[PDB]
Structure formats: structure tokens, C-alpha cells
Write a protein that binds this ligand. Structure first.
Ligand SMILES: O=C(Nc1nc2cc(CN3CCCCC3)ccc2n1-c1ccccc1)c1cccc([N+](=O)[O-])c1
Length: 287
């Protein structure tokens, strides 16, 4: 890993130029824990994350991120080129992902074309492959969601944001409950820490992929994409009613097969959910 100095990152990113990149600016977006600006360093196009509760906590997350990235390298995870830590606007520098977040591509932010089913199917696989690598190496992510799935030039899915990750014996509890609520497993909302919560959160991501709908939307009914599964489990609606209409290449069989993986992932009881390796298998069998 490479240590940088702050100014080098400011400079190259146009003094963290808040104007959006779709209009020649550099701001690519907002994370939960900071803001991300495009730039070029020695001809390498890059992403640099300006970090934004506790002072010992935010630091601890930065450390955890670098610790996870030092141990885990895989094509379905983001790649840390290095950091910058001397300015106290803490910084982490990554290889740049052109196609931004899955969330943003699912919404077609900034006018990008809808993703084909075929491409969605490989996105799900790659993401599952990324989570599996994490779990093989005894990490729980704790904030799996479509904004934390980045996408490169060929739409290779990569998992990001490892600041909340934990090592994966008995049930672990925490007093500090964190995550994104529209994605969180019931047990995670109560303060349990287990890899099984990552599977549930991935199930919600699979519903975003199938329907094109964000996990939460306050101007929608229901507000929570999760509630949709209940309407289908009760005979009230089918998955066909919610398939994203911004697609033409989505046959009933592979959609239903993906929905089947999703609903399995979404078992409200942690021990009934498949483990990530099982999820991987089902997503390959799907195609
Ligand atoms: O590359 C990263 N983020 C990014 N690139 C982007 C490119 C486009 C333009 N793009 C143009 C072509 C068509 C589609 C849109 C639009 C948005 C982009 N966002 C981004 C998206 C959401 C939040 C923050 C950054 C990144 C890489 C590693 C680690 C992290 N991280 O968060 O730690 C972020």
C-alpha cells in the first residue's frame, strides 16, 4: 500500500471539486462515511474517499478497512491503492470504477441505460463471489447493499466499504448497532453479529436487481422493498408484477430462479438461510 499526502489528492481531484462529474466536475458521490471524487494520478484514473460518531471510532473504521484490504484481494472486491492520513480529512485511495454503484445504475442516475437481465445475472454472481471470499476469510461485512456494490467497465461487480467488518463459535452481541435499516436482518437490528446477516442483506440486493426498486422509498407504498416479499408469499401479488419493466431479455424461469434464491436468503430465521457458498451455487445453476 502507498501513503499519500493530502494536497496531492486535493490537487488531482480539483480541490475536491463538488461539481458532479456528469457536468465536468469531480464529485462522483456520497457514501455513508464520506464523499468520493474522480481524478487521475500518473495516468491512473482513481477514486479517493474523503472521510467525514466518535473520533477513536472513525479512525478505527479506517484502520479496519485497510486491514481487510491488506488481507483480501479478489476481483469482486474493490482494490485499495493506498491511503492518505496526515491531513485528518482521512483518505483512502482505490482503483477507479467507471460505472459507479449498482444503486445508481439500477436507478439509471445521470441517464445511463437500464441494465439487461443478462448483465444483472452476472452482477449478482460476482457479488455473491465477493461475499463468499470475505466469508472464506472469516469476515462479516455488516453493510451489504447496492450502493456498496461498485461496477467497472465490463460491469464486474465489486464489494466496497469494509470499515464496519468483523471477524466471524457462539452468538456475538454488540451495543453499537450499525448498518442500513432497509437492508438489515432482524437479528442484526437487535445487535447480533453473524455472517448470516450478510446473506439476508444480499437477498434484499437481489430484489433490487429483479425489480429495479430501491430498498426504501418514502414516496412509495410500500416504502420497504422487503414488504413486497410478504405480498407475494401471501397470494396477493406475484414476482412478475414487480419485475423491472426497463428490460426485455428476462424470461420467467431465470427471474423466478433468482427470486427463489432471494426468498431463501430472506428467511426471517437466520439458521434456515443458505450460506454464501450455497447461494453461489444456486446463482450459477440459474444460468
Ligand atoms: O469508483 C468509485 N466510485 C465511483 N465511480 C464513479 C463513476 C461515475 C461515472 N459513470 C460514468 C459512466 C457511466 C456511469 C456513470 C459515477 C459515479 C461513481 N462513483 C461513486 C458512486 C457512488 C458513490 C461514490 C462514488 C470507488 C472505487 C473504489 C472505492 C470507492 N469507495 O466508495 O471507497 C469508490
Amino acid at each position: 500500500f502507498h501513503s499519500f499526502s493530502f494536497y496531492e489528492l486535493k490537487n488531482v481531484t480539483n480541490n475536491f471539486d463538488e461539481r458532479p462529474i456528469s457536468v465536468g466536475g469531480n464529485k462522483m458521490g456520497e457514501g455513508g462515511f464520506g464523499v468520493v471524487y474522480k481524478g487521475y494520478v500518473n495516468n491512473t484514473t482513481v477514486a479517493v474517499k474523503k472521510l467525514a460518531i466518535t473520533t477513536e471510532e472513525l479512525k478505527q473504521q479506517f484502520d479496519q478497512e485497510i486491514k481487510v484490504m491488506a488481507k483480501c484481494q479478489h476481483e469482486n472486491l474493490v482494490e485499495l491503492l493506498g491511503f492518505s492520513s496526515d491531513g485528518d480529512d482521512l483518505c483512502l485511495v482505490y482503483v477507479y470504477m467507471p460505472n459507479g454503484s449498482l444503486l445508481d445504475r439500477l436507478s439509471c442516475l445521470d441517464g445511463t441505460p437500464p441494465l439487461s437481465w443478462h448483465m444483472r445475472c452476472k452482477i449478482a454472481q460476482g457479488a455473491a463471489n465477493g461475499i463468499n471470499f470475505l466469508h472464506e476469510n472469516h469476515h462479516i461485512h455488516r453493510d451489504i447493499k447496492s450502493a456498496n456494490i461498485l461496477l467497472d467497465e465490463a460491469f464486474t461487480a465489486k464489494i466496497s466499504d469494509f470499515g464496519l467488518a468483523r471477524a466471524s463459535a457462539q452468538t456475538v452481541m454488540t451495543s453499537r448497532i450499525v448498518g442500513t435499516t432497509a437492508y438489515m436482518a432482524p437479528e442484526a437490528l437487535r445487535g447480533e453479529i453473524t455472517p448470516k446477516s450478510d446473506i439476508y442483506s444480499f437477498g434484499v440486493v437481489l430484489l433490487e436487481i429483479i425489480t429495479g426498486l430501491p430498498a426504501v422509498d418514502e414516496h412509495r407504498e410500500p416504502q420497504l422493498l422487503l414488504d413486497i416479499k410478504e405480498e407475494i408469499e401471501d397470494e396477493e401479488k406475484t414476482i412478475e408484477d414487480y419485475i423491472d419493466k426497463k428490460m426485455n431479455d428476462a424470461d420467467s424461469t431465470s427471474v423466478e430462479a433468482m427470486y427463489s434464491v432471494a426468498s431463501q436468503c430472506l428467511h426471517e430465521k437466520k439458521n434456515k438461510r443458505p450460506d454464501i457458498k450455497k447461494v453461489q451455487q444456486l446463482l450459477q445453476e440459474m444460468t
